[PDB]
Structure formats: structure tokens, C-alpha cells
């Protein structure tokens, strides 16, 4: 998979640049990089192809380049209508196509809001049902992009972690939920567990102790 | 004009076989290459397969482990994808995408290949809203409701909610104190865990002062299984 930043944010009129690191087997091996925009609940749209070229009827604000194994997408003068997810794709020396992880691009429409995060331990009831689930809930954050990181004590944890896609509230802020399923034993063995949401450079952290 | 429509989707059993069908229009079908692109819920795009114009050449993703086969019927302007031994992790959105293409020019003259077929271009210029595919076997089942009690951490404002887990199929409706409670209420979207069953969570923000003087009860209605539940959440 190609490497794109999880999220980039800016103000309207401001200029932005998404990077797309790759290898010598694709991006660095060919000048066939394409960029796609996917606006919410819609289907992808070609913005750039062969690195820098713009299909007919595509804004002069979308620019593309490349350097070694890393190509870029540069939006000049962000409009709100640029909001959405962006995917870079390259030809490979296996004659396959590859996609990047995707980058949620946010153009501010309302003043930034730091998330409100709460962490629940497993209920006694679930634990009598021989199961365990830590619920990590996040609300009231804008832009609508966050990074959920779980940690068992000091060490990070990736297995058994589920995270929903941010959704809009009644107050137009964003919310997201992250579950960490555990066995009753795993849950008893560790000192504590950490939920770490990263939002706009800032990171909040709550912690549940089985104790 | 240039358009693709995806169909043949729905909910299917693991280990079963499936066959999707894309339908084009507004362009010369038998001149372009075709792609399948999938997108697991909330995930990123993923390449599946590419078929040549005449359909005598196919390319598949090395991570599909050869569980997929791509085909086409140019006389019907229709593209096909077919599965075998589906898996729950095969849950995703399945897009149909044309491969850009056309003549190639040196000087002022343009050259084709034999038959006057287009050389390929390397960017999917046409997309059709994918049809969705869901892999789960669990017969209709009712949900279990566990209390997410107010952490001892909170003065200020406290948060508490219900963890409604292990139901099928969607949807589930979640109210608080019988609808009387609305402000500060956030009901999250459901997740499909490995289980093949759905889980979700509804939470409500309140003044920590209200704790012990105000009774919070989440009302869960899972119409499919005809199950209604009432749980009290307390410190
Ligand atoms: C592909 O993207 C990665 C991140 O996903 C980029 O990583 C970071 O790139 C910068 C530029 O080389 C590294 O240096 C930076 O310098 C600026 C000042 O010039 C400073 O403000 C930054 O704090 C940073 O020191 C940065 O260390 C690096 N981070 C890493 C390596 O994780 C990277 O630029 C891209 N690919 C390559 C090959 O650089």
C-alpha cells in the first residue's frame, strides 16, 4: 500500500500539499501516478494522472508532481467543495494498480473544536458473560478527523481494535467510537489500558484500570 | 452519457459463490479495459482486477489469492466478477471503473495497434456507484444491552451510555428515558465485528450533579427480532 498522511487541514484560500511516498516498483518506477477525489457518499473522481496532468474540465487549482519514489498533490486556494477523501494510485512493475491509504482533507467551516473523550471498562455483566469490551467514545471535534491509538500499559495494541468513521452530530460537530475487545483474562493481567485520540496535532488520553 | 451501473449485491453466506454484474452505456464498450475496485466500510480503495478490451487478457490482485475471476460479455456491454468461498472480510463496496485509453501520437500522426484498438492509459476515468456486499451467516438475533456507567472521575459533566452488542440484522433504535432525553445524545454508527454480528453505542452527556438524583434508562428497539429492552445506567 502507498503511504499518505491520514489527514490534512487548512483554511479557505490557503494552499495545501498531500504527499504519497512509495517505492521504486511503482511511483519511482513509472510516471503513471493518478489522483482521485471521493466526496462523501459519492464515487471517486479523477483529478490528476501521469503525475501532473489535469483531465479536461478540472480546476487550475489542482497540481501534481513527483520526486524519486514520492509524488504529491497540491491544492491551491482551498474551496470548501474540495472537502473529501483523496487517493493516489500508481502502476506497478507487476502490471498491477495500487492505491494509497487515502487522505481526509478538511477545509474549516466552523471554528476548531477539541474532542471530548471517555473510556469505559468492561461492565461486570459482560465479564460474567465471559467477555470484555473497552468502549472509547469521542464527540464534538472539528475538523472531522481523528487518530485512535490503543495502549496496554505502555505498549501499543492493534489487535481486536475496531473504529467507526466520524459522523456529524445535531450540532454539526463530529463523533466517533472505538472498541477494544478483550478476554476476561487479558483484561485482568495488565496494569491499565490507554485510549489515545489524536486530533489536529493535539492528543487527549484517558485510561481504564481493571483494578 | 458515459455511465456504469453496479448490481447483484446484497447479503450472502460465507463459503458461498457470488457473481456481480456491471452495465455500461454512453460509450464504445468493447474498446476500453475495465476494473473492479473494492472499499471495505470506512476503509480505503483497493484494487481487485483489470480486464483487457477483448477480454483475452486478465490481471488479478495477488492478495485475492485467486478467489476472484473477472470476465466480460462485450455483446451485452456488461462486466462480470465472480467469487468462491467468500469471507466475512470480503465485506466492502464494489466499484466498476473504466480504464482510460486512446490513440498515441508521435509528430502529428496517431498510431493504434492491430484492429485499431486503443492503447491503455493508466487512470480510471469513469466510475459507477458500487453495489454493496455483506458477508454474514448469523440468522436474525436479538441484541444484548450492557451499561456504560459514569466514570468515577466526574464534578463538571459526566458521560454514560449503553453498549448494545451482538445483534443481526440492522437496524436498531435507541432512545433515552423514553425520548424525553435528547440534548447531549449521540448514537454512534454500528460496527460489524469478526463475529458477523452488529454492535453500537449510544451515549448521553449530563451534569455530574444529576448523578443519583436522575434516573437514566436507555430504550433499545431491535425491530427485526421484535425485541425491546430497558436498562438503567448508574454510578
Ligand atoms: C513521506 O512522508 C513522511 C511522513 O509520512 C515524511 O516524513 C518526514 O519528512 C520530513 C522531510 O524530510 C522529515 O524532516 C522534517 O524536516 C522539517 C524541517 O525541514 C521538520 O519541520 C520536520 O520536523 C522533520 O524533521 C521528517 O523527519 C520525516 N518524518 C519521518 C521520517 O517519519 C517524508 O518526508 C516522506 N518521504 C521521505 C522519503 O522523506
Amino acid at each position: 500500500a502507498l503511504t499518505q498522511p491520514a489527514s490534512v487541514s487548512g483554511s479557505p484560500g490557503q494552499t495545501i500539499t498531500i504527499s504519497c511516498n512509495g517505492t521504486s516498483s511503482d511511483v519511482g518506477g513509472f510516471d503513471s501516478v493518478s489522483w482521485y477525489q471521493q466526496s462523501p457518499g459519492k464515487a471517486p473522481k479523477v483529478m490528476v494522472f501521469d503525475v501532473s496532468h489535469r483531465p479536461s474540465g478540472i480546476s487550475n487549482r489542482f497540481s501534481g508532481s513527483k520526486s524519486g519514489n514520492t509524488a504529491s498533490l497540491t491544492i491551491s486556494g482551498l474551496h470548501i467543495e474540495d472537502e473529501g477523501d483523496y487517493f493516489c494510485s500508481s502502476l506497478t512493475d507487476r502490471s498491477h494498480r495500487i492505491f494509497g491509504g487515502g487522505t481526509k482533507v478538511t477545509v474549516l467551516g466552523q471554528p476548531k473544536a477539541a474532542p471530548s473523550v471517555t473510556l469505559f471498562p468492561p461492565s461486570s455483566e459482560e465479564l460474567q458473560a465471559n467477555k470484555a469490551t473497552l468502549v472509547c467514545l469521542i464527540s464534538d471535534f472539528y475538523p472531522g478527523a481523528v487518530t485512535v491509538a490503543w495502549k496496554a500499559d505502555s505498549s501499543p495494541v492493534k489487535a481486536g481494535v475496531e473504529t467507526t468513521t466520524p459522523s456529524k452530530q445535531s450540532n454539526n460537530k463530529y463523533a466517533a467510537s472505538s472498541y477494544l475487545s478483550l478476554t476476561p483474562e487479558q483484561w485482568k493481567s495488565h496494569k491499565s489500558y490507554s485510549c489515545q485520540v489524536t486530533h489536529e496535532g493535539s492528543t487527549v488520553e484517558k485510561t481504564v484500570a481493571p483494578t | 452519457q458515459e455511465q456504469l451501473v453496479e448490481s447483484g449485491g446484497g447479503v450472502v453466506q460465507p463459503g458461498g459463490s457470488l457473481r456481480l454484474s456491471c452495465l455500461a452505456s454512453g460509450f464504445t464498450f468493447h474498446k476500453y479495459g475495465m476494473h473492479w475496485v473494492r472499499q471495505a466500510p470506512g476503509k480505503g480503495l483497493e484494487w481487485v482486477a483489470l480486464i483487457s478490451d477483448d477480454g483475452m487478457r486478465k490481471y488479478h490482485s495477488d492478495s485475492m489469492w485467486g478467489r476472484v475471476t473477472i470476465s466480460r460479455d462485450n455483446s451485452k456491454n456488461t462486466l462480470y466478477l465472480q467469487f468462491s468461498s467468500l469471507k466475512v472480510e470480503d465485506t466492502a463496496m464494489f466499484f466498476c471503473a473504466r480504464e482510460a485509453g486512446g490513440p498515441i501520437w508521435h509528430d502529428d500522426v496517431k498510431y493504434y495497434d492491430f484492429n485499431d484498438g486503443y492503447y491503455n492509459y493508466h487512470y480510471m476515468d469513469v466510475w459507477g456507484k458500487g453495489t454493496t456486499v455483506t458477508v454474514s451467516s448469523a440468522s436474525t438475533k436479538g441484541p444484548s444491552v450492557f451499561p456504560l456507567a459514569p466514570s468515577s472521575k466526574s464534578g463538571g459533566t459526566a458521560a454514560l451510555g449503553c453498549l448494545v452488542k451482538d445483534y443481526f440484522p440492522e437496524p436498531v433504535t435507541v432512545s433515552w428515558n423514553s425520548g424525553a432525553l435528547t440534548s447531549g445524545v449521540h448514537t454512534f454508527p454500528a460496527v460489524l465485528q469478526s463475529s458477523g454480528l452488529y454492535s453500537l453505542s449510544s451515549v448521553v452527556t449530563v451534569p455530574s450533579s444529576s448523578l443519583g438524583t436522575q434516573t437514566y434508562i436507555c430504550n433499545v428497539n431491535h425491530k427485526p427480532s421484535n425485541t425491546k429492552v430497558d436498562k438503567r445506567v448508574e454510578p
Side-chain angles (χ1 to χ4, degrees):
Chain A
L2 303 181
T3 296
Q4 308 179 207
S7 144
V8 323
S9 291
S11 309
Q14 203 162 57
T15 301
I16 248 172
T17 299
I18 309 175
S19 59
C20 181
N21 296 290
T23 76
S24 50
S25 305
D26 32 87
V27 173
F30 309 90
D31 304 54
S32 306
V33 182
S34 328
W35 290 86
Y36 302 91
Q37 175 207 98
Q38 184 186 49
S39 295
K42 302 179 182 182
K45 183 178 187 168
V46 202
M47 315 296 302
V48 173
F49 64 80
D50 298 339
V51 184
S52 61
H53 291 84
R54 288 176 291 274
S56 196
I58 280 191
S59 209
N60 309 12
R61 325 189 311 272
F62 288 83
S63 168
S65 66
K66 198 245 292 186
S67 187
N69 305 325
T70 90
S72 307
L73 187 68
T74 297
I75 308 181
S76 53
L78 276 178
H79 297 353
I80 19 163
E81 32 250 292
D82 295 336
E83 207 151 56
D85 294 10
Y86 289 80
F87 304 86
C88 71
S89 93
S90 174
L91 189 61
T92 84
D93 52 11
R94 291 181 50 81
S95 290
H96 297 329
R97 310 298 166 86
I98 177 182
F99 287 86
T103 299
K104 161 141 184 177
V105 175
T106 304
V107 179
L108 297 172
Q110 58 185 20
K112 272 185 176 177
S116 174
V117 356
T118 301
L119 182 47
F120 294 95
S123 47
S124 296
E125 331 216 352
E126 176 172 35
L127 289 173
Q128 288 301 327
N130 211 51
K131 299 192 182 184
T133 295
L134 303 181
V135 191
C136 188
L137 307 152
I138 323 169
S139 54
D140 285 324
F141 56 88
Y142 190 95
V146 293
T147 290
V148 178
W150 289 88
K151 276 173 55 181
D153 299 352
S154 299
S155 302
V157 169
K158 286 193 181 182
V161 176
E162 301 303 331
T163 292
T164 68
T165 304
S167 57
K168 191 191 73 176
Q169 310 174 183
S170 47
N171 58 27
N172 306 300
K173 312 280 188 50
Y174 285 91
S177 61
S178 180
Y179 305 88
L180 174 55
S181 297
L182 284 181
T183 80
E185 291 76 37
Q186 282 183 323
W187 168 241
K188 283 180 166 64
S189 71
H190 291 84
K191 275 187 174 181
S192 51
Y193 285 81
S194 298
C195 179
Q196 293 180 3
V197 333
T198 311
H199 173 259
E200 294 289 342
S202 302
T203 281
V204 184
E205 184 198 43
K206 286 309 182 66
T207 300
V208 284
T211 63
Chain B
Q1 299 154 354
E2 338 205 18
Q3 177 194 22
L4 297 167
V5 294
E6 190 56 30
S7 66
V11 180
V12 287
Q13 296 289 334
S17 263
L18 177 55
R19 167 177 152 277
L20 301 183
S21 50
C22 195
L23 178 150
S25 57
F27 71 88
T28 339
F29 186 67
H30 54 90
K31 291 184 175 182
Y32 304 94
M34 296 293 299
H35 295 271
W36 284 99
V37 187
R38 98 164 160 189
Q39 179 168 30
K43 301 311 170 191
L45 288 181
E46 180 182 2
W47 181 68
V48 175
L50 153 62
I51 187 172
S52 58
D53 45 13
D54 65 9
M56 302 211 299
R57 294 182 303 274
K58 310 174 187 181
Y59 300 77
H60 299 107
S61 174
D62 301 314
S63 56
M64 285 302 141
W65 305 111
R67 292 190 294 96
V68 297
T69 305
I70 187 174
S71 59
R72 67 186 302 164
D73 188 359
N74 280 342
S75 58
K76 292 186 179 181
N77 282 18
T78 287
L79 180 68
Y80 301 103
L81 183 67
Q82 188 155 336
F83 281 89
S84 63
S85 64
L86 289 160
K87 303 174 185 180
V88 180
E89 311 90 52
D90 286 309
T91 293
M93 283 287 304
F94 280 84
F95 291 99
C96 195
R98 184 178 92 180
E99 163 79 4
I104 202 281
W105 63 107
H106 265 278
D107 203 53
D108 87 320
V109 63
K110 301 180 289 188
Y111 321 89
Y112 294 25
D113 86 293
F114 150 98
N115 252 355
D116 285 358
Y118 298 177
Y119 292 167
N120 267 341
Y121 264 9
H122 309 166
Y123 74 89
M124 307 157 181
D125 56 354
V126 190
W127 306 78
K129 77 182 66 174
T131 204
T132 172
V133 174
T134 301
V135 173
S136 187
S137 62
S139 42
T140 46
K141 179 187 181 297
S144 308
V145 189
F146 304 99
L148 305 165
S151 63
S152 299
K153 191 166 190 173
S154 48
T157 58
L160 59 83
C162 300
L163 173 49
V164 181
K165 68 195 294 295
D166 291 3
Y167 67 93
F168 184 106
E170 288 218 80
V172 177
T173 66
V174 185
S175 55
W176 281 91
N177 289 8
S178 306
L181 188 45
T182 61
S183 292
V185 172
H186 309 82
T187 304
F188 291 99
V191 58
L192 175 59
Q193 290 167 325
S194 170
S195 59
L197 296 165
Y198 291 87
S199 304
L200 64 78
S201 299
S202 186
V203 298
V204 57
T205 275
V206 300
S208 63
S209 64
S210 58
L211 301 186
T213 60
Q214 180 180 340
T215 307
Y216 301 89
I217 306 175
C218 83
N219 324 107
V220 180
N221 183 1
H222 186 244
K223 308 177 197 299
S225 69
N226 291 327
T227 285
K228 295 189 176 187
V229 174
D230 303 322
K231 245 288 187 178
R232 293 184 194 176
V233 200
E234 293 169 346

